[PDB]
Design a protein around this nucleic acid. Sequence first.
DNA 1: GTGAGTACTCAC
DNA 2: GTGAGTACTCAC
Lengths: 190, 189, 189, 190
Amino acid sequence: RNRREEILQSLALMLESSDGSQRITTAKLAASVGVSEAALYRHFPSKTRMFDSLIEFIEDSLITRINLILKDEKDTTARLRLIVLLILGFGERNPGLTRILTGHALMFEQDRLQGRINQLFERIEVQLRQVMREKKMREGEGYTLDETLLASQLLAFCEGMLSRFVRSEFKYRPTDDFEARWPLVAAQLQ
Amino acid sequence: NRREEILQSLALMLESSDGSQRITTAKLAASVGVSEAALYRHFPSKTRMFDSLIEFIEDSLITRINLILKDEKDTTARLRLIVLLILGFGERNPGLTRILTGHALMFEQDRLQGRINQLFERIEVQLRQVMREKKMREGEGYTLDETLLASQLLAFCEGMLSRFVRSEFKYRPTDDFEARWPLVAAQLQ
Amino acid sequence: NRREEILQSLALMLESSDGSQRITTAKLAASVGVSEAALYRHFPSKTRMFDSLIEFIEDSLITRINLILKDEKDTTARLRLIVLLILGFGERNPGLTRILTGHALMFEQDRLQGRINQLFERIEVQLRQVMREKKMREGEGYTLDETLLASQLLAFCEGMLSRFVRSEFKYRPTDDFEARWPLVAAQLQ
Amino acid sequence: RNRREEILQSLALMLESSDGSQRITTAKLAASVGVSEAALYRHFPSKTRMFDSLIEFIEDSLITRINLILKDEKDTTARLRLIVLLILGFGERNPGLTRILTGHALMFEQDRLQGRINQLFERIEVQLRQVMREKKMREGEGYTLDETLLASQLLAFCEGMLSRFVRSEFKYRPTDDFEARWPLVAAQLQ
DNA sequence: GTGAGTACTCAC
DNA sequence: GTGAGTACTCAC
């Protein structure tokens, strides 16, 4: 119930906190939830599972809002801008999950989990390319450069900002100066 | 000279598929050829080894950036070379890249990451200095704040190294540099 | 009634290939249907559950032994039936035999094994009594001490049950009983 | 090693004690040896291996001595007598290891170990069968009854005495009254 | 839900 | 060699 979600909420908070640079032991996670280690296992079979649930929430949040953007906004460049802003905004709003997105928190857990995060990035990049491929249809002319190069370029930018947010103890917020940065990023869309 | 032997090994392990998880002293000592006991007669701790690795990263990079500034007069070409240098060094030293992106350091003392952040700040400060001299050198500078442009530049580098590490070194940082650079440079206005 | 359901399920579990290891209360509750806390409204402990299973074994065996004594007057015939009964009871109740041999009690409180040792002493004393009455009943008794002969008989029973358990119940206790009994009986001197 | 053997000796000793009816945790075995649990792992990869070492010892002792008996004793009945006496004598002087041989100590450990013990009993039983089959050749008149029945019958007696020794927490010594018991046991060899 | 535990690990 | 952990389990 609120207990399962509660554990998850405490895990994200520890991830966001200074404890997030260290492994989140079941002991430490249990202490933070206010219950015993055993209590944790009534709701999850493993710690691996808790990260899986956190990753599911990240994928759902991002994929669902990406589709929302695609249905509401039809301008290709506007689409690109909004998806990038959504990723940075989502990361900034959830520092602990960003720590999962950048791979850092997963260093202590199952290699499979980083695999999940890589698939999520591939999905996002795949959507980026698709948006780019509709421009010719949408406005008469496509981009001159390879969409695969442009999309990796956009994602590289997002991953770079998230990585900085993480190394800086979350001081370098991902959306800071977004308005001044986007124009620079868009200049690449040739 | 074991001090160097140990560091070399740690780097090799960092580069190997075993670099995605804790590098134990037992495994490191085994890798070298000695015992965990011999290991500690060259280093007080494991942190010391990473401190040594980090210092190696900083000298390699700062030393080469200075060479670039003395070898290349053009502002944009300077920027291109410094980025290429960061991406290139990362590609040629995957294990150390793992330290640069902070992943390998999750298993170690927090101040080691602060040391990496200092290197990044140092580099960003140099990128800012290069950009500011454009006006004096070539006449007209950049329309935008150098702080915005240099962070934009480093963000690109970190993103590329991050992908390199994520993909278990499959996505090469300098891959397609030729085509990526002009796009990055398009961001310098 | 639920009390019977639990005991029956415990016995079934002791009988399965899982009887070879600890029977957790979670898994026992699962088998039954109720929750773990429900279980504790019928039994204050797991130890009580085995006490119940041990009382069952004791009643069964002692009740059957008394019947034997009333239905059979021959001394040697009486010993044969008591041994067959023990072997047959064990065979038709694999799970309970695991208690009789002491293996299933390894995960439990030590007093339970002591209770099993009391059943065995009880059975051995009966065996002794049957033997002591041979003289008055048929004329001449045994040359050897009844204590030696009765323990010899129990040793054969425990050995047969022990093997039944080791072998994951493949070596049934009554297998070749008719061929074995005359051999065991040759020990009765 | 002194430490390796020391650990095994401590394990065997714990198995003989009041602790033997319970799980021999690494914590308890470590306290018994006088070292830390980690010290234990400098000598064994797992506790399973300590039990494996102990079974190897039981195996070797028994098989090596049975072989010696077969070379020192010509008479079939005498061979059978000495082998049964050896099995019981070994158990009596190694109470902790008998707890392994009866399968009780193994209830907490890997099932594979009980398999090794069963293999040992099968090896012993096959030797007894082999000794029994030789009676004909060696002295003319072999046994009237099947050797398989006779050997399982001897082994049942051994396993029966060892089980009692264990149940009783070693009060019913396996060799007590051996001399009065053997002729009864031999009376079965028909 | 939890105290106590469970085999096994790590840096030094 | 070992102190302090590791994720996970058990009976109640």
